[PDB]
Amino acid sequence: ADQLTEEQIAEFKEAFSLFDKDGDGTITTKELGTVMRSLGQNPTEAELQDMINEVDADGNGTIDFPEFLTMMARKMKDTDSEEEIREAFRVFDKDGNGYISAAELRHVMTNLGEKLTDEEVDEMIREADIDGDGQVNYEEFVQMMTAK
């Protein structure tokens, strides 16, 4: 528990609503599995049980706030920003044709929850489209992800 400033409860609160589908005040097997599904994986039902049981200290079948912080305090794992670099490409390149297709990008919105219109879908593409080839190459992808 390295979080002693109030401000941090404030931050954590917002975070809770991120996975709380039914805002029941508890994390359940249903909402757990939905979010992972978004990760592009097809976990089996038994996965919901095995995973929840491991974190569920009180054996009540769900994860509450106290059980939440314990993990957050020890969840300081260092992810090399590179881990998501190459991997993020494979997801976008659905058919692995060596290029990022517009149809493939469209699905990305759904994951981020941007609910972009046709206009904005085309707009983003223009930004990376250094040439009127109508497709986004690996080089263009990097230029855009070159944030920090």
Binding site: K75, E114, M145, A147
Partner: peptide, 28 residues
């Protein structure tokens, strides 16, 4: 658009988190 970094990048940032939560469950 200038500074198109915000639009593109924003989404990248969330994905890092996506799996930050679950890693706790798996434990490597």
């Amino acid at each position: 658009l200038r500074r198109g970094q915000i639009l593109w990048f924003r989404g990248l940032n969330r994905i890092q988190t996506q799996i930050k939560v679950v890693k706790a469950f798996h434990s490597s």
